[PDB]
């Protein structure tokens, strides 16, 4: 048996956003609940934590989220709440209900993505990569640049190399390689095809010498 | 708020090799009701922790038994008794015993494989970029071990810090490197006003930084 968060999404810094987390079957609904989040490619930071009714629903918080986040819970429903208000940038993260049957922060869901931004669906600039101003190998690449939301694909038309995104001043960034025998480049056509599905663009660019 | 320090941030093991982890703590993990609430999750690739061990030694429902965990009070260690393919992500401790409830940076259990130097390619901004007013100059720097590098950009000569936006991928599926993508941005204007443009990389596999540069003016 186990938990199944929902209720995050895109929201404006803030904002404010209510997070629900379901138990599964068993059979108790004594036992305490927690809330645990984590950035993009960052560590796990704890936020919350409500006891069950015998314990008086005791909440605590981390110092992050005080007087800004409440955690709370309906035991009729089978619910634990996450009530996020005055909503910030760094409140970005996957956030996580995090419990035990008797074995502490044992059962983890999938999680439920918040993102905090100002942000605008933003159709990516797609730059060629080519050298230069003479070996076996050639590498070539596109710069995939100023995007919202998230998803962009690179596909190279496999030693491709796809590097994560980076968040710039409210806008993605990403950038892919191909490398590729000399004997194929410039003498055939090497393109990469960039879709972005949110802004509806799909990029072709062949790389020219 | 209870400081919960890893060592060590980074382990390169073989597959079948033991390894072990350490956890370490700001003050005692002991509860006044006499327990021990320092717990191990592994997180892997795309996922969500999973529980290992939890107060300290206790093995979670179906973890493997090549999983254990040792210490006492402030003193941490999680061993791996043969690492196996599946074991690889991110390893946490994590402490319940004092509020805020807190966790250690991670560490991450990565492939052992030999020292490879990286391929660097640097690239001019694009005629596409130029139009627009922009100027984006990027380096590759593409299949090296261990993953430790640092990349300089030099505009004619000087280091330049402002502009710069660095992308590391994890270690590959096949032959288990570390590749890099670093580019200096300014304006079309800016570009235009200068014209050696050079990124250096420095890496365990010389002692002589990596330079890569193009002059603009040529290009």
């Not at chain 1, 989220?65 to 208000?85: A, E």
């Not at chain 1, 919202?148 to 496999?158: G, I, L």
């Not at chain 2, 327990?35 to 795309?46: R, S």
Request: hydrophobic share 30%; aromatic share 10%.
């Amino acid at each position: 048996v186990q938990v199944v968060e929902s209720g995050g999404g895109l929201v404006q810094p803030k904002g404010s956003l209510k997070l629900s987390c379901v138990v599964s079957g068993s059979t108790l609904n004594n036992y305490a609940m927690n809330w645990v989040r984590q950035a993009p490619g960052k560590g796990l930071e704890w936020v919350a934590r409500i006891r069950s009714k015998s314990n008086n629903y005791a909440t605590y918080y981390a110092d992050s989220v005080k007087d800004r986040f409440t955690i709370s819970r309906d035991d009729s429903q089978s619910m634990i709440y996450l009530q996020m208000n005055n909503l910030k940038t760094e409140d970005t993260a996957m956030y996580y209900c995090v419990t035990y049957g008797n074995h502490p922060f044992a059962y983890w869901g999938q999680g439920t993505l918040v993102t905090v931004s100002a942000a605008k669906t933003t159709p990516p600039s797609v730059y060629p990569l080519a050298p230069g101003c003479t070996g076996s190998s050639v590498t070539l690449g596109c710069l995939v640049k100023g995007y919202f939301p998230e998803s962009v694909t690179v596909t190279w038309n496999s030693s491709v190399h796809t590097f994560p995104a980076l968040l710039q001043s409210g806008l993605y960034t990403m950038s892919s390689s191909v490398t590729v025998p000399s004997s194929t480049w410039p003498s055939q056509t090497v393109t990469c095809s960039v879709a972005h599905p949110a802004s509806s663009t799909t990029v072709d660019k062949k790389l020219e010498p | 708020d209870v400081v919960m320090t890893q060592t060590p941030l980074s382990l390169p093991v073989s597959l079948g090799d033991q390894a072990s982890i350490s956890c370490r703590s700001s003050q005692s993990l002991v509860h006044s009701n006499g327990n021990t609430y320092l717990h191990w999750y592994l997180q892997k690739p795309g996922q969500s922790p999973n529980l290992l061990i939890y107060k300290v030694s206790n093995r979670f429902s179906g973890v493997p038994d090549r999983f254990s965990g040792s210490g006492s009070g402030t003193d941490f260690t999680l061993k791996i008794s043969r690492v196996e393919a599946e074991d690889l992500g991110v390893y946490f401790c994590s402490q319940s015993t004092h509020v805020p409830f807190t966790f250690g940076s991670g560490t991450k259990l990565e492939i052992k494989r030999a020292d490879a130097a990286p391929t660097v390619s640097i690239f001019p901004p694009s005629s596409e970029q130029l139009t627009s007013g922009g100027a984006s100059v990027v380096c590759f720097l593409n299949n090296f071990y261990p993953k430790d590098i640092n990349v300089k950009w030099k505009i004619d000569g000087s280091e330049r810090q402002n502009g710069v936006l660095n992308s590391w991928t994890d270690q590959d599926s096949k032959d288990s490197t570390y590749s890099m993508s670093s580019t200096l941005t300014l304006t079309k204007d800016e570009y235009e006003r200068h014209n050696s443009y050079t990124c250096e990389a420095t890496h365990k596999t010389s002692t002589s930084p990596i330079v890569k540069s193009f002059n603009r003016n040529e290009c």
